[PDB]
Each structure stands twice: as C-alpha cells, then as structure tokens.
C-alpha cells in the first residue's frame, strides 16, 4: 500500500472477454471525473465545471483499450486460460439527504465488491420495476482490484411507497433485494 | 451455471503529497484481480509481482523507448494533470446542509471535499457517528447521533469562513 | 482553449 494527500487514476482501463466489453475513465480521490463512451467515441465529464474547463481526447482511450485487448489475449495463453472468480457483492440503500415527505430526494444504492465487472442494478417501487429517474456511475476501481458501482433513483417521499434495489451478479445465487422505506 | 470471463485492468496511478513537492506514479497490469507487473517511479523499472510478470517486465525493461516514456509520465501525466486539478477539482468547495431531526441526529449532507469535523451547554463524550459517506456524485455525507435546554450542533468544513451552528429549542 | 488532459499508456505485451 501507498499513502498520499491525493490519489488519481489517469486512468482506469478495463477490457474483458464477456461481450467483449471495455471501460475507460479517470478518477480523483475516489470520484470519477469522466468516462469515454467507447461506442460513440465521446468523453463524458461528470461535473458542469469539468465540462466547462477540461478536455480529454477520446482517441487515447480507444487506443489504450485496443492494447488491453492484445495484452489479455497473450496473458490468457500464459495463465493456461485461468478464468475470473465470481465475488459476492455488498448492497446498501440510503438517501442522499434527510427524508421529508413531499420533498424530492435521491435513493443511493451502493454495490461493492463487484467481480467480474458485469452487473445488473435495477429499482422497484411497490414491487414493480422503475426506469424513470434512474442513473448510475461507471465501475469505480478498488485497491483489491474489484469494483464498486453506485445507482441512483430520484423519488418523492410518501407513505404507501416502499422501495427496493435489485442486484443481479454471477457471484450471487439469487438476485439481491435491498429494501428501503421511510 | 455461469458464463466464463477473462478480465484485464490497466491502472495508471498518481500519488500527490504536500502540494507539487512529492509526486509518485504506479502503473498496474492486472490479470483478473491479480497484479502481475508494475512500474513504481520510486523504483524506476518494471517489476514482476507474480510468476505471470517476468515475460512482460523483463521485455519492457529491455526497450529504451518503453522505459523513457514510463519515466517521463511523472511529468507528462501526474505533474501536467495536477495543474489542471489546481484550477478545478482542488478549488471545488461545497458547503454542507446541516439540520437536526429527533436520539437527536445532526445530518451534515452534500459537502466537498472530505475534511469534516462535527461537535455537539458544552461538547459531550458519548456520541455515535457514521463513517464518512461517499455519495458518488462529488458530495459527501456524515450523520452524528446523540442520546437525550438548548442543543447545538457545531460543523467545521474548509468551505466555511465560520463554523455553521444549528440549534434545537 | 482548454489544455488536454494527460494519460498513461499501457505497455504492450510481447507478441513473440
């Protein structure tokens, strides 16, 4: 382990056989600055400030991931085709700010110990699926080389409105349901 | 019954201490969750971490242009980008929203950066506090509870010129 | 115009 006032990943390069799929992002002090949409060849900054004052050429992400794809192919042969082990994720649901009935809030669903980086995070309101007002972070790195993803749900707090965070991963024996009610 | 997956991660990390004085880089080449090779600027050469690493670290160390780029990345990556953080990220200061709602809980929400100190008449010694909560949208959270006159919550954060006090009754 | 962010490049595994 290394200790410092600040830790930045410039950046997090991920490529895996399942899909195949890749991820390119930069992090600072544990928060994601941006990600590159590898299909749209576009840099997506995570703050209005970054969008207004910073710039990353997406062409460098794509080229990096191309080398990862080459590297993975070589190392699969070297490791005598050793596949990834599935980890059990840890799901936590909590609000963004204090709950006030009739005051727009955000439910935060933290999914930690993701490995491999393949996950389905969804929301439920009174047992039924919710797509309206849902958004999530990219896979965020960890020192142990597992990941964490955070999912959000904008909602209006009310009585007779129970919430759930449904997580699907190969590390689980059944889809994890993390409940939340105010 | 689960799909087969082979994962590869390349992590180019920068460690900053005492402004621009101390700077250290570590590049990590990971097969699944196993880091097999790395270049630490303090070492100054690619090192094999696991027996999967010698064919890559020895090869990279034999190529001058690979060693020269990796070494120069302390300047072309770490130092370059820290000046870009200085003007944006490091000047980002979001003041917390402090409220008390009855066990009396003082909720300190949506603040940036991490550096926070919360105190609770005179200050008490029997308070249960949450660890620092990372919301993931560049804002933090911390909740301080207290068991069982005027009750006051004292919050100190770099964004504030003076600590924010919230009273009860 | 905003200065372009720097980034590390992965070293390429030996093809032979």
């Amino acid at each position, epitope marked *: 382990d290394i200790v410092a006032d600040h830790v930045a990943s410039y950046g997090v390069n991920l490529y895996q056989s399942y899909g195949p799929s890749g991820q390119y992002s930069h992090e600072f002090d544990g928060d994601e600055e941006f990600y590159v949409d590898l299909e749209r060849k576009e840099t997506v900054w995570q703050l209005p400030l970054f969008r207004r004052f910073r710039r990353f*050429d997406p062409q460098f992400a794509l*080229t990096n991931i*191309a080398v990862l794809k080459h590297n993975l192919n070589i190392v699969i042969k070297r490791s005598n085709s050793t596949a990834a082990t599935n980890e059990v994720p840890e799901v936590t649901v909590f609000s963004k700010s204090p709950v006030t009935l009739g005051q727009p809030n955000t439910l935060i669903c933290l999914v930690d110990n993701i490995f491999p980086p393949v996950v389905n995070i969804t929301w439920l309101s009174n047992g039924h699926s919710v797509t309206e007002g849902v958004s999530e972070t990219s896979f965020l790195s960890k020192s142990d080389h597992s990941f964490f993803k955070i999912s959000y749900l904008t909602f209006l707090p009310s009585a007779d409105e129970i919430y759930d965070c449904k997580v699907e991963h190969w590390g689980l024996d059944e889809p994890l349901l993390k409940h939340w009610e105010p | 019954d689960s799909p087969e997956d082979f994962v590869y991660q390349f992590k180019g990390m920068c460690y900053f201490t005492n402004g621009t004085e101390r700077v250290r880089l570590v590049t990590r080449y990971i097969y699944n969750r196993e880091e097999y090779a790395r270049f630490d600027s303090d070492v100054g050469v690619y090192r094999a971490v696991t027996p999967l690493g010698p064919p890559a670290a020895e090869y990279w160390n034999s190529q001058k*242009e690979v060693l020269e*780029r990796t070494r*120069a990345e302390l300047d*072309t990556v770490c130092r*370059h980008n820290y000046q870009l953080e200085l003007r944006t990220t490091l000047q980002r200061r979001v003041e917390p929203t402090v409220t008390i709602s009855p066990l009396l809980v003082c909720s300190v929400t949506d603040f940036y950066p991490a550096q926070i100190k919360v105190r609770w008449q005179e200050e008490t010694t029997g308070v249960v506090s949450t660890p620092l909560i990372r919301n993931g949208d560049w804002t933090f959270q911390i909740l301080v509870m207290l068991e069982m006159d005027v009750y006051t919550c004292h919050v100190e954060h770099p964004s504030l010129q003076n600590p924010i006090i919230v009273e009860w009754r | 115009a905003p200065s372009g962010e720097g980034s590390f*490049q992965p070293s*390429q595994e030996n093809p032979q």
Partner: T-cell receptor
Amino acid sequence: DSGVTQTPKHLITATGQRVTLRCSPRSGDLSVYWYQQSLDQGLQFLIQYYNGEERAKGNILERFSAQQFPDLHSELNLSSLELGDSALYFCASSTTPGTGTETQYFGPGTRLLVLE
Amino acid sequence: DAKTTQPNSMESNEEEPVHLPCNHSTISGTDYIHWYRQLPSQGPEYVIHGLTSNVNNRMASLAIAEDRKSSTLILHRATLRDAAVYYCILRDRSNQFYFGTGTSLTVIP
C-alpha cells in the same frame, strides 16, 4: 534499411483504373501507417491499422481504402484514379499504436503515376 | 493540435556545424519534440527526440529551450550526405504524425 518492404516500387496506370499497393511491416511490428507525398500537398497521413483493425484516419478519400491481414501486412487500394493521385505512397510500421518516444520505420515507397 | 514552424530552406558549408531551428510556442506539457529526415526520393527516417532535457546521439544533438517554446537540431559537422528535408514534429501518446513542410538543407563544399 528500416526493415519495412513495399511493392510495387514504381507504378504507371491510366485514369479511372484501380491499383492495390502492398506493404510488409517489420517483424514484430503490430501497427501499419500509410502516407502520400505529392508536390501539391506534401507528406500527408492517410490511415493507421493496429492488429488488423482501423486505428487512425487522416484526410483519406472514400475511393481510398486499406486493410491489415492476420500476418499484419497491409494493402492500400486506390480506385477511380485521377491524375492528382500521382504521388509517392509510403507505408510505415511501429511496435505499438504509438507513444511520444516510439519510432516509425518507413518503407521505400511506391511511385504511382496516373496518366491520360 | 499544436503545430511547429521552421525555415523553408537553409544553406550550410561543409565541415561546419548545422543548427536547424524549430518553433513551437503553443507546445503542451504532454508533447515530445521529434526530428525526422528525408533524402530524395527515399522514405523519412528518424533522427532524434526529446521532452525537456538536451539529447545527444550518434546522428545528432537536440537542444530544447528552457520554456520549451523552441528547439534546435544540431549536426556537429556538415557532410554533403546531410543535404535533406528535416521535419520537426510534435508527438503525444498515440496521436498521428504531422510532417509539415520542414527545412530543405543544402550543404555546399
């Protein structure tokens, strides 16, 4: 010299014809580049392939197309030839897709002359 | 994005040093300085490259100004074989080469 070979060395063709230029990179080199050096526009970059897939594009015309096979050799195909396409076509190779310290090794070129 | 400027031609005397200047005020912290040479009608060939520190090799030397706003290619003793077109190119990660017009060096005996 540089280990990069190119065929044919010289080429004379008429207008409206198609030509296919071949390029063998250096052993071990995984990236291939195509440049066009004319009197009119100088040395211009056309296209870059890496591990058989397109990696970079310059101001290449739709009637210009390239490929990189599993043996990493490359082919530049020039269709519907015009007199202006009369130039020197260079191919280059490099180990990786490129870094700030990495050298590009160039072939001897193909002299293409498009006549009426 | 950042481009270089050079003299279009230079005439040097044989056996005398050659100092080929390059200008790049707009250089980035991420940009390396490269020099390539091309004899007629052969392909370009690499000479030297650097970042901030002055570089010396068999072919030539490279002087980079303290502010990194200019550089120089040094041939310590001109030869008739040195007459060629010299390209000062900026390189960053995997971005493409831009040769530009260069300096046509002619050596006189």
